[PDB]
Design a protein around this ligand. Structure first.
Ligand code: CA
Ligand code: CA
Ligand code: CA
Ligand code: TB
Length: 146
């Protein structure tokens, strides 16, 4: 039973993925989005990637499947591999560290203007140690913090 408060937040993600507002996420748009994220996925990956979110193999993604894909993860096993790439995917420094600055560097290219007072707070609001920066160890805390 997904609460509305959750179903809403998800909507925000879509508008971020489907810039065309067609109502379906395609590979051409997916790669383009990940291509600007500093990532360089292969053709076999992007195409095969959609499959993961495409259980019906229709060639596109909808709301029911868009949430299921994310929700499912919460209702199944997880691979620290995804937490590594995504995380290291932001630390272009390959150092594995995301400072309130670096985060603002990438999250900024997203195409949305964010405020420092917010980012600084978020990162500092999640940093169980409050070091103004997030470490790989902290990343687990969130998933290990009931
Ligand atoms: Ca589209
Ligand atoms: Ca770094
Ligand atoms: Ca720290
Ligand atoms: Tb589908």
């Amino acid at each position: 039973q997904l609460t509305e408060e959750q179903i809403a937040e998800f909507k925000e993600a879509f508008s971020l993925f489907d810039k065309d507002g067609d109502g379906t996420i395609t590979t051409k748009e997916l790669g383009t989005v990940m291509r600007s994220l500093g990532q360089n996925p292969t053709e076999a990956e992007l195409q095969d990637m959609i499959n993961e979110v495409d259980a019906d193999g229709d060639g596109t993604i909808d709301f029911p499947e868009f949430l299921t894909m994310m929700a499912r993860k919460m209702k199944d096993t997880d691979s620290e591999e995804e937490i590594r790439e995504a995380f290291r995917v932001f630390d272009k420094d390959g150092n594995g560290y995301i400072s309130a600055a670096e985060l603002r560097h990438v999250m900024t290219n997203l195409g949305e203007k964010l405020t420092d007072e917010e980012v600084d707070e978020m990162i500092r609001e999640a940093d169980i140690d409050g070091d103004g920066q997030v470490n790989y160890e902290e990343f687990v805390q969130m998933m290990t913090a009931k």
